[PDB]
Amino acid sequence: GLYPSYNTSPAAPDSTGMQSTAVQLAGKIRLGWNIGNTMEAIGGETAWGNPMVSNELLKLVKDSGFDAVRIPVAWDQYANQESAEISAAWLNRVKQVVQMAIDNELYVLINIHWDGGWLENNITPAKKDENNAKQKAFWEQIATHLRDFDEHLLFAGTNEPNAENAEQMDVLNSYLQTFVDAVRSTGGKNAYRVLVLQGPVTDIEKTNELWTHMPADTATDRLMAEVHFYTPYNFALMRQDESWGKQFYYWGEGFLSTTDTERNPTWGEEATIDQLFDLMKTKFVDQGIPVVLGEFSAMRRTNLTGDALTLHLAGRAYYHKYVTQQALARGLLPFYWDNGGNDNFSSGIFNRQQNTVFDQQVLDALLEGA
Ligand SMILES: *CC(=O)N[C@@H]1O[C@H](CO)[C@@H](O[C@@H]2O[C@H](CO[C@H]3OC[C@@H](O)[C@H](O)[C@H]3O)[C@@H](O[C@@H]3O[C@H](CO[C@H]4OC[C@@H](O)[C@H](O)[C@H]4O)[C@@H](O[C@@H]4O[C@H](CO)[C@@H](O)[C@H](O)[C@H]4O)[C@H](O)[C@H]3O)[C@H](O)[C@H]2O)[C@H](O)[C@H]1O
Ligand SMILES: [Cl-]
């Protein structure tokens, strides 16, 4: 009894609008966009440069060709730390954003993101019990408040849990079972809702190596797995050279440099992507289990000038088309990581301030890849 029970209005199981299995639900989704740096921002929905999610944004997203949004959400900072009660106002706000995305005929995946680290950086036997308790209390509140949405709303229990060995993986399995049991306990449409479970560090290789099983579920065929993809780091996100490796400015057959050769990839090209996706195809998809590719993007390097710029941008685009297409070919649901930035080292494909397209190049790539 570290915190009180938040499962206070359990409802009869309700199969209405909840007719699809994870596999069927997955058939409906081919392209996803993260509302990145927004509802998960530390300090508030607008503390990381993005405006509050508006219907206009969600209408643009649907209209641009996305079927789904992944909505990272911060929770801990809105919560009474003694009782783990989440502000009702935050809860209403997350509900309201869910309602609007569902008004726009988008599928929606809400998580508890990094959220300041309380779970994500503490996949550890010392923290296991208090974190299991907090997981339970928060998921009880989130699931109850969102209980009435149809199958357009999926839940994801964690973001990127830092488990790098089998001991930490056993703690993660517990954190995931707690999530599943929380949500199911609230009843209603939550008795059948599709839930998404995260691999260790959402890393394909560590998931293949460490993952053992899915949490136990009272529902039949309502679970998906999730990985992320930022491979190779040197291209997608590296902003400075280190002793151990240099930033890649270019990527893809066709788009490599002959002037500035050390800025080409030494790894993480087309074959590696295909290989990593095949691990996820054989461990999960062939076994009956869709895989959410919850985040991928290669950041823009607008600090390049002239011919270097022009070439980086061509490979960047292709990287995104290639990832999308190769994931879809193997039953991974690709969700683009959009942090809303339109500046250097950012990933925003929309201009959130004007509800317009900022990077038509990357959007067409994603679409043609879809
Ligand atoms: C493995 C995996 O899948 N990881 C995922 O990685 C992606 C890619 O990194 C993550 O998204 C990134 O999140 C960080 C926040 O990071 C926290 O949560 C993720 C944790 O893993 C990490 O340990 C945590 O620190 C985002 O960084 C934050 O960005 C905001 C906004 O401003 C920046 O980004 C937009 C650009 O346009 C802009 O140029 C750049 O500054 C920062 O907020 C600003 O901070 C300044 C500094 O004081 C302040 O002036 C200003 O008013 C604020 O707006 C914040 O400082 C910074 O932490 C990153 O953008 C995002 O891509 C994903 O969450 C993982 O799941
Ligand atoms: Cl349908």
Side-chain angles (χ1 to χ4, degrees), residues 76-81 83-95:
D76 199 23
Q77 78 192 332
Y78 302 97
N80 180 288
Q81 298 295 306
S83 77
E85 193 185 355
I86 296 161
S87 135
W90 187 235
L91 282 169
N92 280 324
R93 177 57 189 151
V94 175
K95 178 174 204 198

Side-chain angles (χ1 to χ4, degrees), residues 81 83-104 106-163 165-205 207-217:
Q81 298 295 306
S83 77
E85 193 185 355
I86 296 161
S87 135
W90 187 235
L91 282 169
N92 280 324
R93 177 57 189 151
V94 175
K95 178 174 204 198
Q96 167 171 61
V97 172
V98 167
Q99 188 54 259
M100 293 187 311
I102 292 175
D103 299 339
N104 286 271
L106 293 167
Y107 291 84
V108 181
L109 185 53
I110 254 81
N111 78 5
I112 300 188
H113 208 62
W114 173 67
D115 200 25
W118 65 272
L119 187 137
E120 178 158 308
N121 306 137
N122 290 293
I123 312 284
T124 225
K127 292 280 178 279
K128 176 184 166 116
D129 297 342
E130 68 209 78
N131 279 348
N132 265 320
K134 179 163 268 183
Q135 254 299 77
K136 178 165 161 197
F138 283 182
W139 277 110
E140 282 177 343
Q141 293 174 80
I142 297 155
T144 295
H145 209 63
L146 308 176
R147 183 152 55 203
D148 290 337
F149 292 103
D150 66 10
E151 72 185 24
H152 281 90
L153 176 61
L154 298 64
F155 297 147
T158 72
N159 174 46
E160 179 176 58
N162 301 170
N165 62 54
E167 183 198 309
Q168 297 188 290
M169 184 72 227
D170 284 357
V171 175
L172 177 48
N173 281 319
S174 180
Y175 290 165
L176 297 176
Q177 185 66 62
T178 299
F179 155 69
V180 174
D181 296 346
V183 165
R184 298 291 179 236
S185 86
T186 53
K189 293 150 204 285
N190 292 333
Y192 305 104
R193 187 181 314 284
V194 178
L195 308 171
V196 180
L197 297 124
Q198 290 71 48
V201 44
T202 53
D203 171 85
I204 281 176
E205 278 160 303
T207 296
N208 187 58
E209 171 198 11
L210 304 164
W211 181 272
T212 147
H213 58 293
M214 214 42 67
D217 194 1

